[PDB]
Coordinates of C-alpha atoms and ligand atoms in Angstrom, one line a residue:
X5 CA -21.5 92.7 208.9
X6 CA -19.1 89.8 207.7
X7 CA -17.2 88.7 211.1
X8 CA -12.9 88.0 210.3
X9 CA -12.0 85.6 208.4
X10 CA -10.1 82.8 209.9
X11 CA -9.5 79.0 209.2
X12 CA -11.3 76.8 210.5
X13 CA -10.9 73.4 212.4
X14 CA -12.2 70.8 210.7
X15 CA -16.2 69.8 211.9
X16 CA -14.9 66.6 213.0
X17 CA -12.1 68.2 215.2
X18 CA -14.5 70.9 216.6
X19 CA -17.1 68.1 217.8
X20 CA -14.2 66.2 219.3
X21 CA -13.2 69.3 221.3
X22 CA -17.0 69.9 222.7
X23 CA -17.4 66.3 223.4
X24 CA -14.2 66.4 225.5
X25 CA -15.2 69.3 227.4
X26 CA -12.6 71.5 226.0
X27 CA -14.4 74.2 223.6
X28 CA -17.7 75.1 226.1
X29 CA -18.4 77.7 223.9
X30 CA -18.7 80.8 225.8
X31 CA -17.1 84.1 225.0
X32 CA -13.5 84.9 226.9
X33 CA -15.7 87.5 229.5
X34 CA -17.1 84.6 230.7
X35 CA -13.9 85.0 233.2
X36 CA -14.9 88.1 234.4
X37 CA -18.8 87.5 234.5
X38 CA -18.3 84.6 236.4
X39 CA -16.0 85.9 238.9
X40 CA -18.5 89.2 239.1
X41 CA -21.1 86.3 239.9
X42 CA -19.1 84.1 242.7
X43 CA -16.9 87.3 244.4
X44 CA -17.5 90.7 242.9
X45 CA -15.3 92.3 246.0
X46 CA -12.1 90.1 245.5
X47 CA -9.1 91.9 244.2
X48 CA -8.6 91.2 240.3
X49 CA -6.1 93.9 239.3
X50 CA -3.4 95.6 241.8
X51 CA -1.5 97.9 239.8
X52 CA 0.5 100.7 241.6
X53 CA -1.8 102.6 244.2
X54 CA -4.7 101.1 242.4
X55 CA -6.8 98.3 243.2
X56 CA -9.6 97.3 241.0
X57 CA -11.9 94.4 242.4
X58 CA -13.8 91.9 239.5
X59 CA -17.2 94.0 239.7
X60 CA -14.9 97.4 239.0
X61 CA -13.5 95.9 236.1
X62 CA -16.4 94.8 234.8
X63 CA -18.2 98.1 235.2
X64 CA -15.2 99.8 233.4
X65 CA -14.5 97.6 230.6
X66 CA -18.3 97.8 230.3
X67 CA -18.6 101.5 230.2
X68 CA -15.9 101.6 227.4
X69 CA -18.2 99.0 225.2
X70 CA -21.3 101.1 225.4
X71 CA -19.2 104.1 224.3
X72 CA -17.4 102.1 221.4
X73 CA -21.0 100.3 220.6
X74 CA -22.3 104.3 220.2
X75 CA -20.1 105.0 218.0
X76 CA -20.9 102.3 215.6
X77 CA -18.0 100.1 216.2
X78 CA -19.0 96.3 216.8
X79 CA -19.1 93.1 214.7
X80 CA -17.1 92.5 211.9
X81 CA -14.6 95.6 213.2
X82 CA -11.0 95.3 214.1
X83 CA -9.0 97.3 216.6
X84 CA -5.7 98.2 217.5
X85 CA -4.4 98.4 220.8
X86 CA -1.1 99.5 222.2
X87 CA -0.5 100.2 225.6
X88 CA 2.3 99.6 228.6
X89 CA 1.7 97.7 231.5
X90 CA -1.2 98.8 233.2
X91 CA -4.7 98.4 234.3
X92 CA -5.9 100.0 231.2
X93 CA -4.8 97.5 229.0
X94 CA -7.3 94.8 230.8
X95 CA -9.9 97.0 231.0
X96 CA -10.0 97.2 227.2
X97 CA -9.3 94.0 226.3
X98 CA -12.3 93.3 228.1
X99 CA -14.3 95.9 226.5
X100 CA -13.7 94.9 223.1
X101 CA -14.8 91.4 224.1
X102 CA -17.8 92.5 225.0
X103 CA -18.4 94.8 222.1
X104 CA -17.6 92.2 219.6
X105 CA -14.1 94.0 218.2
X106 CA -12.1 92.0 216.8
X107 CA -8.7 93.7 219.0
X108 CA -5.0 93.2 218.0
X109 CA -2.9 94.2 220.9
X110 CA 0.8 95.4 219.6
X111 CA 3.6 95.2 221.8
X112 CA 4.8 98.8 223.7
X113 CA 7.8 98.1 222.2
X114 CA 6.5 97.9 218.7
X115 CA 7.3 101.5 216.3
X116 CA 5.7 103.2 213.4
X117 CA 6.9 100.6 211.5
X118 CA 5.1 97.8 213.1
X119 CA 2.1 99.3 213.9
X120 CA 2.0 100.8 210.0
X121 CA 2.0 97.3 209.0
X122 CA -0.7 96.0 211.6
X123 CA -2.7 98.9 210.5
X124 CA -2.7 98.0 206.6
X125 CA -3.3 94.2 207.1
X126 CA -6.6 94.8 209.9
X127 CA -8.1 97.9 208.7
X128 CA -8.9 99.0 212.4
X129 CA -11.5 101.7 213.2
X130 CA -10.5 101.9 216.2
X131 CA -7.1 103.2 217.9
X132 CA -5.6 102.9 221.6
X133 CA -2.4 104.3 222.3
X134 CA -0.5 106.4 224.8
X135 CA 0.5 110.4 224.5
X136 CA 3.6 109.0 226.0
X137 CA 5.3 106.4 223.5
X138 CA 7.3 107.6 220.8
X139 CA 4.9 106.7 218.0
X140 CA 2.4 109.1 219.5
X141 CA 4.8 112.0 221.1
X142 CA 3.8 114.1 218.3
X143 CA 0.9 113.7 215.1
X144 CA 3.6 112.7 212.4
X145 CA 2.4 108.8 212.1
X146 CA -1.3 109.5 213.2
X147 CA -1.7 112.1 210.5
X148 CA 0.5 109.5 207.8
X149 CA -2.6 107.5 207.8
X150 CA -4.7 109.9 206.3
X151 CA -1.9 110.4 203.3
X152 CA -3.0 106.5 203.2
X153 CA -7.0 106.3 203.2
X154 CA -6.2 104.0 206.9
X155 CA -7.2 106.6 209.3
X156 CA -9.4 105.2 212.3
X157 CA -12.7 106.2 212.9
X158 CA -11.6 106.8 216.6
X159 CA -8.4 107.0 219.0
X160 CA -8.3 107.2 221.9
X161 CA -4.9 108.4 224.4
X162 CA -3.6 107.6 227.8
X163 CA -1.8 110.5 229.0
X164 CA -4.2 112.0 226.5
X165 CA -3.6 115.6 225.1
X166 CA -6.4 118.1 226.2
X167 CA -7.7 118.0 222.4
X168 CA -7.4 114.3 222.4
X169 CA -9.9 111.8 223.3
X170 CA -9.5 111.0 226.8
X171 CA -8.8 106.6 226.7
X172 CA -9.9 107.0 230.8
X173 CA -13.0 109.8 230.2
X174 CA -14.2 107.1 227.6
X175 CA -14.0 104.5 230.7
X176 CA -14.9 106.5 233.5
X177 CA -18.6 107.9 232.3
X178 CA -21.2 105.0 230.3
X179 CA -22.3 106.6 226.8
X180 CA -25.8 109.4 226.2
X181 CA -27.3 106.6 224.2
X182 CA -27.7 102.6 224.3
X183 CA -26.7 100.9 221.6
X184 CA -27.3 97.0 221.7
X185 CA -23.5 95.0 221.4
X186 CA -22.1 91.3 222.3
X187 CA -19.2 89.0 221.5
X188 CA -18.1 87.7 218.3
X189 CA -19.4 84.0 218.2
X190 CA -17.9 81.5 220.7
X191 CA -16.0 79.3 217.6
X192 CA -15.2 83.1 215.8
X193 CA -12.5 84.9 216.1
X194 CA -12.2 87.3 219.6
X195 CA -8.6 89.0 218.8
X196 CA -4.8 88.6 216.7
X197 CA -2.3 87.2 219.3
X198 CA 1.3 87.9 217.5
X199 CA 4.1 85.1 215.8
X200 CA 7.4 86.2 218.0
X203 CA 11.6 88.0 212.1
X204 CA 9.7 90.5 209.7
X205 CA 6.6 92.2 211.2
X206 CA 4.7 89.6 213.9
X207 CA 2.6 87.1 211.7
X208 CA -1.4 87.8 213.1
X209 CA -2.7 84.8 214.2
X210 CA -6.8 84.6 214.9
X211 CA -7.3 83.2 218.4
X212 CA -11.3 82.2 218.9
X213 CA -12.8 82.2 222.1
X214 CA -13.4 78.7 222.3
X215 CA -9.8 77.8 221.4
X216 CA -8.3 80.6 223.9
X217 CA -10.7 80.1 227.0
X218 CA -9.8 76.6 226.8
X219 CA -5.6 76.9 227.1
X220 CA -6.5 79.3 230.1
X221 CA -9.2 77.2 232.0
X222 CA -6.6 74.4 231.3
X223 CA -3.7 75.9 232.0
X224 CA -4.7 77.5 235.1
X225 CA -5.6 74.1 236.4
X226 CA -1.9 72.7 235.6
X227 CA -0.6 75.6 237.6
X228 CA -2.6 74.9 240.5
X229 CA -4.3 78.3 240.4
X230 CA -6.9 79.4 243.2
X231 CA -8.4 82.6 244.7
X232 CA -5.1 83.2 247.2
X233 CA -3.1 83.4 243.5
X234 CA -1.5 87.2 243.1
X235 CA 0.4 87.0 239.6
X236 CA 3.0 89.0 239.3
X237 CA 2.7 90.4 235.5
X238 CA 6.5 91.9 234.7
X239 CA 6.4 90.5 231.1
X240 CA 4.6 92.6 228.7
X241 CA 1.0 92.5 229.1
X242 CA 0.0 91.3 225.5
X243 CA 2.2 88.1 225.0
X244 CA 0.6 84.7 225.0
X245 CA 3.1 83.7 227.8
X246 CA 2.1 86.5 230.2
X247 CA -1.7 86.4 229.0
X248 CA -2.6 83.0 228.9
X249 CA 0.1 80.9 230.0
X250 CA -1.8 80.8 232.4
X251 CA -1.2 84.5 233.0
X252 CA -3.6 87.2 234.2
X253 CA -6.6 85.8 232.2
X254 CA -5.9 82.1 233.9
X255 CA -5.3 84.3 236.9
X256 CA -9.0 85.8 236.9
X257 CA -10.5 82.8 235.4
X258 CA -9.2 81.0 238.9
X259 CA -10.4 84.2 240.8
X260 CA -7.4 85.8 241.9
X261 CA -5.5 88.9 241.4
X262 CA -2.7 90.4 239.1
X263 CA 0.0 92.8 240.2
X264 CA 1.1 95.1 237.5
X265 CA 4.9 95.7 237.2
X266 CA 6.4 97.8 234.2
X267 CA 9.1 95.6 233.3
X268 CA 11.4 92.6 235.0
X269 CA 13.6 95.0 236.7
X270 CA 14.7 93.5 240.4
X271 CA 14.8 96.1 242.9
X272 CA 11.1 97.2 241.9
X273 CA 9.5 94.0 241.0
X274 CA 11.3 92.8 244.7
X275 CA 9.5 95.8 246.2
X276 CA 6.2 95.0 244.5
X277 CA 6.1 91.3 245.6
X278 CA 7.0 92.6 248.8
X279 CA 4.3 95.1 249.1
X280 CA 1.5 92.8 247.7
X281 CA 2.7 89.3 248.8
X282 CA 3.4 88.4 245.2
X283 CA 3.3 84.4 245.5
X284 CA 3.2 83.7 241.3
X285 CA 5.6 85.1 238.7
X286 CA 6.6 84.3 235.1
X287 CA 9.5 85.3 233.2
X288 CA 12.1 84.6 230.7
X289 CA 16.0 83.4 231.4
X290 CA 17.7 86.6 230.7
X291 CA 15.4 88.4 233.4
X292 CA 15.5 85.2 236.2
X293 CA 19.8 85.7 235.8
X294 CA 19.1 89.2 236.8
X295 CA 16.9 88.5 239.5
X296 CA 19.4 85.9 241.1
X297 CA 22.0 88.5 240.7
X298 CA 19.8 90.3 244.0
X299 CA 17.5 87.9 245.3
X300 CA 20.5 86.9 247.7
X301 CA 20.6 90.6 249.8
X302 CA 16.8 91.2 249.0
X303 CA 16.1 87.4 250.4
X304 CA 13.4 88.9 253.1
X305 CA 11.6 90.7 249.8
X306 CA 10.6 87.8 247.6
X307 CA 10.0 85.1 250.4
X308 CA 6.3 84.9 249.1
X309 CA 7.1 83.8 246.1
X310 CA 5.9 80.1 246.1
X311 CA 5.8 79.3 241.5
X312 CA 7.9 80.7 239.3
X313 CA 7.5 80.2 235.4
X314 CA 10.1 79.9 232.9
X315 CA 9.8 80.1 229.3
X316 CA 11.9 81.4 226.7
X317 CA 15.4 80.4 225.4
X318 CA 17.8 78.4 226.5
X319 CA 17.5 77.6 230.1
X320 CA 20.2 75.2 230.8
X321 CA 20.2 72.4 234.1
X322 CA 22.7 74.6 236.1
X323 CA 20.4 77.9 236.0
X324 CA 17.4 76.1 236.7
X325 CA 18.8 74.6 239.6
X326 CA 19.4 78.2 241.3
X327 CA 15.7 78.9 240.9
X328 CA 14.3 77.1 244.1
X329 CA 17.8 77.4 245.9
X330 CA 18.4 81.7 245.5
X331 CA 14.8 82.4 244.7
X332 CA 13.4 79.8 247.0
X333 CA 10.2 79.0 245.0
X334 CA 9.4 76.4 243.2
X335 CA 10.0 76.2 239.5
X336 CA 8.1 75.5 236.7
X337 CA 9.4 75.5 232.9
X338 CA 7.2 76.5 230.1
X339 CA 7.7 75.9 226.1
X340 CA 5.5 77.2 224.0
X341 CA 4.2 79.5 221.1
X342 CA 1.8 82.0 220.5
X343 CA 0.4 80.1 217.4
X344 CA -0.9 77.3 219.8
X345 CA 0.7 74.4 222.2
X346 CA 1.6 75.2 225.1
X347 CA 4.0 72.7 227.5
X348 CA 4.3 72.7 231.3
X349 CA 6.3 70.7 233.6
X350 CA 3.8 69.5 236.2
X351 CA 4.2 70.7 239.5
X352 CA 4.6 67.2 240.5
X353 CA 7.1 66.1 238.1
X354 CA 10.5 65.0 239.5
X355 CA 13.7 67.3 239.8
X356 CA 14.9 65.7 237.2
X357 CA 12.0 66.4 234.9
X358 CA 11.8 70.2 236.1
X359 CA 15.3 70.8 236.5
X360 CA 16.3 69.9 232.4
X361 CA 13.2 69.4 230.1
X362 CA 10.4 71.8 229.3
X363 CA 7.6 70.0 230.1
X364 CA 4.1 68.2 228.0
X365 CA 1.7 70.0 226.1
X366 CA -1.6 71.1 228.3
X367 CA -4.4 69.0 226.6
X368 CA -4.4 64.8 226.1
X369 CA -5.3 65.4 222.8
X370 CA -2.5 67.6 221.3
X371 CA -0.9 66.1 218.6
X372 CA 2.6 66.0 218.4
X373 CA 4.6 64.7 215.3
X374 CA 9.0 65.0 215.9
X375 CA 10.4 64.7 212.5
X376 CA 13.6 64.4 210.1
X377 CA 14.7 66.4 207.1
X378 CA 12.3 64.3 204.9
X379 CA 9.2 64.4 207.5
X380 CA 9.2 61.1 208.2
X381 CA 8.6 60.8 212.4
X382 CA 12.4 59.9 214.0
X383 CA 13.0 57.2 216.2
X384 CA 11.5 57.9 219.8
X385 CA 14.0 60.2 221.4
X386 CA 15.6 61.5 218.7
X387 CA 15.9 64.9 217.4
X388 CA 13.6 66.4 215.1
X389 CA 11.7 69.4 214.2
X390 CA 8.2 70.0 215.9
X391 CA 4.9 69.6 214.4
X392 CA 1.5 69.9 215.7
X393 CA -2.2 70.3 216.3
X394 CA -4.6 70.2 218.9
X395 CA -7.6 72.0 220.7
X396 CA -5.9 75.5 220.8
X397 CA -3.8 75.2 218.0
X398 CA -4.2 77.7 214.8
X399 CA -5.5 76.4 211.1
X400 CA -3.4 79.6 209.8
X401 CA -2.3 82.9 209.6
X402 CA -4.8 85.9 208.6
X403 CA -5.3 86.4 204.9
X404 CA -1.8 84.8 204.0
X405 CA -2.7 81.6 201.7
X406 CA 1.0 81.3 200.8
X407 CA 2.8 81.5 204.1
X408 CA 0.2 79.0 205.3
X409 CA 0.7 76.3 203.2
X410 CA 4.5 76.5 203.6
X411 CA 4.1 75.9 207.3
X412 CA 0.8 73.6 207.4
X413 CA 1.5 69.7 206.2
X414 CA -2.1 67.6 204.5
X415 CA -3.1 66.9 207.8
X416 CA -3.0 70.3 209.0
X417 CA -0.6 69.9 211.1
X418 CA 1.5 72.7 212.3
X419 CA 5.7 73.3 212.0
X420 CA 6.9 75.6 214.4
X421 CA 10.4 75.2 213.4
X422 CA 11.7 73.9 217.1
X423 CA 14.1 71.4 217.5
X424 CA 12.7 69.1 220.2
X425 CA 13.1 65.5 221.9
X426 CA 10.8 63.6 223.4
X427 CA 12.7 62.3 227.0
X428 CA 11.7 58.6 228.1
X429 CA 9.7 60.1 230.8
X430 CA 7.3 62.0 228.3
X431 CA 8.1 65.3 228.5
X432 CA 9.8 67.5 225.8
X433 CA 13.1 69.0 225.2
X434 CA 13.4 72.2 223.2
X435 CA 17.1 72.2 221.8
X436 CA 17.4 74.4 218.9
X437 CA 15.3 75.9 216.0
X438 CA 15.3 75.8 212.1
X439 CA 14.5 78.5 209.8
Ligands
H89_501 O1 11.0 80.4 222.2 C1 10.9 81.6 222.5 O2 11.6 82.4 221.9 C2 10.0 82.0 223.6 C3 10.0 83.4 223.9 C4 9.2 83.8 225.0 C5 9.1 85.3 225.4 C6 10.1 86.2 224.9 C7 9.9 87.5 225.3 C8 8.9 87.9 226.1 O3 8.7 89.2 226.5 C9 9.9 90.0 226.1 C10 10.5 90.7 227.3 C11 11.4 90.0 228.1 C12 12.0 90.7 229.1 C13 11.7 92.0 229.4 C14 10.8 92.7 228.6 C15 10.2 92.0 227.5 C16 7.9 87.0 226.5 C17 8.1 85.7 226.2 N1 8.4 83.0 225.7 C18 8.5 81.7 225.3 C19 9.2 81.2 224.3 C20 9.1 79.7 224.2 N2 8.2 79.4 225.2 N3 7.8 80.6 225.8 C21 6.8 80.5 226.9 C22 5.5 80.7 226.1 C23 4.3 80.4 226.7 C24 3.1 80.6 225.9 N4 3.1 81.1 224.7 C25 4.3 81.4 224.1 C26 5.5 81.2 224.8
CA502 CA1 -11.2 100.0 243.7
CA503 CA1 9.2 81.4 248.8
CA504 CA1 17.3 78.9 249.5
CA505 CA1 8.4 79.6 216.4

């Protein structure tokens, strides 16, 4: 009955962040109670033939809760999740909200070894994956966990086997029993987003913290009800989650459109299909999609934002983005720990076309620094340290790492190499280890 451990912000911080309006303390399904409230019949999820409106989603995701809540999973339980580029993966995300599990969602492209490790540090109960990636092709690492004392209490398979439990019988039929269930607390923690060398780092993301970057960040973005995002990156990541991603998507009441990966001839299809007008990606997939979007011109011509984060995203390539892709671009630096910075939609050519951006909230705290910590001159180099409103406290259960990367005032050191430019935005120009 102990809910995960976590650090906390300190009291002083925390009443700061209610008093400005930016921790309202509701659990992250408020996004999809409220838009159940204001437009139950607007599209939230297109993904292939499918299209799930706000009140089918929250039906679903509240069918799988009641079946989880049955089983005695709830509050002070952890889960892991694993799962490609589909509906599914919204629809329990959203369960587990509601339920109160604590949910880390790996990447598709994570292995055994990965997930072994996510499994010993979490302890889950619960287990979603598919038939149809590797780790799960045949019983081998499922039945390792026993040899371990770390098997789940429950799994759960797409593509399920006809001896499996089925992940969309558990959606589609509400449990015999009702078993009472709810959130985690608003300032507790809702899930594990991911560091992005060694396994991924867990880092507790509450709902106040989270909520916030995506109510914010949907309003940087400009957001509204017309919004269909494209979602080609994987699922999971902060970037394509919150940033503002499908949750800032739904929080501004408009609808995602499932791809399986960045590849152009399909994802030019799928814009075409569903009048795509939002998409977000990283450099190495924008070069491929400028290496079409010439010939397939008449495919993507409602795209009207696309987001860049990533690596290096020099002048010259960001330049092509609103002259092949003819949308307006929009560069993004930031990190799953935290800060996240936009260029404004306003900002000059200049400003969009060769920095990435300023961090979402007034009150993110940005220190730039030199080898002995002391702040540089303005405009100089220096390596990035921070805190603010949506910013971690720590890592789960790892004391040592933590203090390593935390300074006294709890600021965090993401290791980026960064300049502030003299019209206020940042430049990301290298990293240190
Ligand atoms: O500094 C970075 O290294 C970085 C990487 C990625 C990123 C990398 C891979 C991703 O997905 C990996 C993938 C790419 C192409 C096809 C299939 C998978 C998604 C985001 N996104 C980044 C980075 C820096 N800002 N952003 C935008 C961002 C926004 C919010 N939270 C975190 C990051
Ligand atoms: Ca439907
Ligand atoms: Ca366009
Ligand atoms: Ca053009
Ligand atoms: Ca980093």
């Amino acid at each position: 009955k102990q809910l995960i451990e976590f650090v906390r912000w300190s009291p002083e911080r925390a009443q700061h962040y209610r008093n400005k309006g930016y921790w309202i303390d509701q659990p992250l399904t408020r996004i999809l109670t409220v838009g159940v409230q204001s437009h139950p019949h607007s599209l939230a999820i297109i993904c292939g033939e499918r299209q799930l409106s706000y009140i089918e989603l929250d039906r679903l995701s509240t069918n799988l809760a009641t079946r989880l809540a049955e089983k005695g999973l709830g509050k002070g339980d952890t889960a892991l999740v694993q799962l490609p580029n589909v509906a599914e993966f919204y629809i329990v995300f959203f369960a587990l909200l509601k339920a109160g599990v604590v949910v880390l969602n790996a990447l598709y492209s994570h292995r055994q070894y990965e997930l072994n490790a996510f499994i010993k540090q979490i302890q889950p109960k619960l287990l979603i994956g598919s038939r149809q990636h590797e780790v799960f092709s045949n019983n081998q690492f499922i039945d390792s966990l026993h040899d371990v004392n770390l098997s789940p209490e429950i799994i759960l398979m797409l593509n399920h086997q006809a001896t499996d439990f089925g992940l969309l019988d558990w959606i589609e039929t509400p449990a015999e029993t009702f078993v009472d269930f709810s959130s985690t607390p608003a300032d507790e923690v809702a899930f594990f987003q991911l560091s992005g060398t060694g396994t991924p780092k867990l880092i507790p993301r509450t709902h106040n913290d989270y909520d916030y970057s995506v109510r914010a960040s949907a309003e940087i973005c400009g957001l509204n009800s017309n919004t269909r995002l494209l979602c080609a990156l994987p699922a999971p990541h902060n970037f394509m989650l919150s940033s503002p991603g499908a949750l800032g998507v739904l929080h501004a009441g408009g609808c995602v459109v499932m791809a399986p990966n960045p590849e152009p001839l399909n994802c030019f299809s799928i814009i075409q299909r569903h009048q795509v007008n939002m998409a977000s990606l990283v450099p190495s997939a924008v070069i491929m999609w400028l290496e079409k979007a010439a010939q397939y011109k008449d495919q993507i011509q409602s795209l009207k934002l696309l987001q860049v984060g990533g690596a290096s995203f020099p002048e010259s390539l960001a330049r092509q983005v609103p002259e092949v892709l003819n949308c307006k671009l929009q560069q993004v630096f930031g990190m799953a720990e935290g800060l996240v910075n936009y260029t404004r939609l306003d900002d000059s050519d200049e400003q969009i076309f060769t920095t990435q951006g300023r961090p979402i909230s007034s009150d993110d705290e940005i220190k730039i620094v030199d080898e002995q910590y002391r702040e540089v001159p303005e405009g100089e180099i220096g390596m990035l340290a921070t805190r603010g409103p949506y910013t971690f406290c720590g890592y789960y259960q790892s004391p040592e790492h933590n203090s390593q990367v935390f300074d006294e005032d709890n600021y965090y050191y993401s290791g980026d190499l960064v300049q502030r430019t003299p019209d206020g935005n940042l430049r990301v120009v290298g990293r240190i280890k």
